[PDB]
Design a protein around this nucleic acid. Structure first.
Ligand SMILES: [Zn+2]
Ligand SMILES: [Zn+2]
Lengths: 90, 96, 110, 101, 183
RNA sequence: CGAAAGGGUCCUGUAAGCAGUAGAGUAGCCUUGUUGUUACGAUCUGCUGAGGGUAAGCCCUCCUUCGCCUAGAUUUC
């Protein structure tokens, strides 16, 4: 009986009661940023084997124009407005 | 799997199921001791060929408790409700 | 109902296929399990594995194969003359945040 | 450096428990019974040099004093200051109690 | 029969579970499993092993001060058997279990209050540092949306937001490498 | 039926990261000490019975996804 009276008093006082779109949006954006960081780290893990060999320097490897154009397009640069075709050697 | 002194409403199948068998949903026979087969195997139960001579055949069995904890490890809980009540609230409970 | 040229992304659970394997055979065995998985999934006995996928398998040495791996299997047409099989599968490794918790998904052609 | 580390966990190599050592520190009678279960002639130093905290006999007073400067003795002191795990604390961990009327 | 509890970890110890250590001073130690028994033989402290009820009570992660915890005790003075008393004890037992579950959930939520504020602050800091990694439109996509806007007389920002919503809906993953064409 | 996934059941033992008037002490800047302050600093505490693994000879899932299918070949009073 004492326990039930305590339960009624707590329920009257609001002991068991239970309770933002901007916060939800910023949490979703941070989750997207963490996913992008994980993808970048996976790329680095794929391209790095520094225990067994050294990475070939970037200046010694010819970079494909299609890959450069695709990466700049994903970054949001108008490649046609800058004319990447005349720059690329053959 | 309940008895007169253990009032928990529970079935014979252990927590997580019988290992490499599944669940017992049909009628079952509980035999004292061990039997020649393995799990999943056909068992032939036969009437005894002779009238018995021991008092063990005349004894009536009174079960106080049947274990229904997990046999996939060191199971300490007979029901999922008992495991939850001992454990308390988990992180995924508030996450849900 | 399914076309010949089709690409799907799968999660291969290599842990249960490499359970108990001799340590010096685990990565080659995982290569063969990837080939067998692709052959079972696509119906093609000609399976070709991307070298980046091979690097991903051998990333942690001969006995450090990952438990799960996300792959893209692309059934394509063999255009070479005098080929034994009309179709083949090409398997690549997929850059994902976490290989766990992913369903099989059809990759859009565009 | 533990002597014969392979069989350290055998029952025939068991050492005295921390709650027993706590009871030895609290009551000299319990320590007296524990020392009665031993034979003084076989003891190191004829049983004259004894550390209760480590439950250990030493060959000389200089050996006991030098042992008190070591980290095993200080580890035992820290364990005793934190307190030994007992049945009463095991009861309080699950929220059980004894009702004697 | 009765349910015991493990001395080391505090789990329920049903009959034929675990092992009992009989010490020469007169004390029995019931363990529910070989893990607890072997940690005891190695003389580890349950108060320091984080998976034990002893550690959880010492750290304050268990509800201890509660009226529902006063109903269970080792009864050293027996009561003459009474059928009505036993039946009402069963009913009270069920009610006490329900009330204890509710109060435990309240206790856990009071423990886990501040998570939302901490996570929101971390999210704001991460976004403010890495705004450039947020999803954007391609340059070619922006060009084609600009010329669609010029053709249709519509809001370029409107087609940009629609294409951003479509890009957020359509999720695609990148595949490493690529096939080398055979001769 | 197969491959995933989810839930359960077990195993371990509390992830990465961030924070803290916790931290023996040391060195700077000035209010020259009044958590004076800042910096470092094993460790400790919180987020966190969390993270990870889980059938390979564990269980469940018409009602969580994707795929497969009435073959082919050999032989028979
Ligand atoms: Zn000592
Ligand atoms: Zn235990």
């Amino acid at each position: 009986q004492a326990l039930e009276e305590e339960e009624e008093r707590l329920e009257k006082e609001g002991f068991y009661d239970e309770d933002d779109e901007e916060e939800e949006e910023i949490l979703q954006k941070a989750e997207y940023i963490r996913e992008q960081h994980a993808l970048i780290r996976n790329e680095a893990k794929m391209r790095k084997s520094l225990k067994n060999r050294a990475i070939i320097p970037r200046k010694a490897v010819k970079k494909p124009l299609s890959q450069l154009e695709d990466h700049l397009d994903q970054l949001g640069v108008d490649t046609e407005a800058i004319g990447l075709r005349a720059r690329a050697q053959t | 799997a309940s008895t007169e002194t253990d009032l928990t409403k529970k079935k014979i199948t252990p927590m997580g199921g019988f290992v490499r068998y599944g669940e017992v949903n049909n009628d079952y026979v509980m035999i004292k001791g061990s039997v020649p087969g393995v799990k999943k195997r056909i068992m032939t139960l036969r009437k005894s060929l002779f009238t018995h001579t021991s008092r063990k055949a005349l004894e009536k069995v009174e079960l106080k408790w049947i274990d229904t904890s997990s046999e996939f490890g060191h199971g300490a809980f007979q029901t999922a409700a008992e495991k939850k009540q001992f454990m308390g609230t988990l992180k995924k409970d508030l996450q849900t | 109902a399914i076309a010949d040229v089709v690409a799907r992304e799968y999660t291969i659970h290599l842990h249960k296929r490499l359970h108990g394997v001799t340590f010096k055979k685990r990565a080659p065995r995982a290569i063969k399990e990837i080939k067998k998985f692709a052959q079972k999934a696509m119906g093609t006995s000609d399976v070709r594995l991307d070298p980046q996928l091979n690097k991903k398998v051998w990333e942690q040495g001969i006995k450090g194969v990952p438990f799960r791996i996300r792959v893209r299997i692309s059934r394509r047409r063999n255009d070479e003359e005098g080929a034994k099989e009309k179709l083949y599968s090409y398997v690549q490794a997929v850059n994902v945040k976490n290989p766990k918790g992913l369903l099989t998904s059809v990759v859009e052609e565009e | 450096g533990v002597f014969a580390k392979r069989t350290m966990t055998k029952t025939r190599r068991r050492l005295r428990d921390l709650d027993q050592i706590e009871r030895d520190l609290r009551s000299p009678r319990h320590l007296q019974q524990y020392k009665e279960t031993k034979a003084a002639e076989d003891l190191p130093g004829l049983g004259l040099y004894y550390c209760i905290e480590c439950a250990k006999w030493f060959e000389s007073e200089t050996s006991l004093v030098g042992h008190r400067k070591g980290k095993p003795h200080k580890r035992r002191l820290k364990q005793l200051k934190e307190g030994a795990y007992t049945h009463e604390e095991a009861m309080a961990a699950i929220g059980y109690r004894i009702d004697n009327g | 029969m009765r349910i015991e509890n493990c001395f080391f970890c505090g789990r329920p110890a049903w009959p034929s579970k675990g092992i009992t250590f009989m010490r020469n001073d007169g004390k029995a130690f019931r363990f529910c499993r070989s893990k607890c028994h072997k940690n005891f033989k190695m003389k580890r402290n349950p108060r320091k092993l984080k998976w034990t009820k002893a550690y959880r009570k010492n750290a304050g992660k268990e509800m201890v001060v509660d009226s529902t915890l006063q109903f269970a005790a080792r009864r050293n003075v027996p009561v003459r058997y009474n059928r009505e008393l036993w039946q009402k004890t069963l009913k009270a037992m069920e009610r006490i279990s329900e009330i204890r579950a509710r109060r435990e959930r309240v206790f856990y939520k009071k423990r886990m209050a501040g998570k939302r504020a901490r996570e929101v602050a971390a999210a704001r800091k991460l976004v403010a540092e890495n705004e450039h990694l947020l999803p954007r439109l391609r340059g070619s996509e922006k060009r084609r949306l600009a010329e669609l806007a010029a053709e249709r007389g519509v809001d370029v920002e409107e087609l940009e937001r629609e294409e951003l919503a479509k890009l957020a809906s359509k999720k695609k993953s990148k595949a490493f490498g690529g096939e080398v064409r055979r001769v």
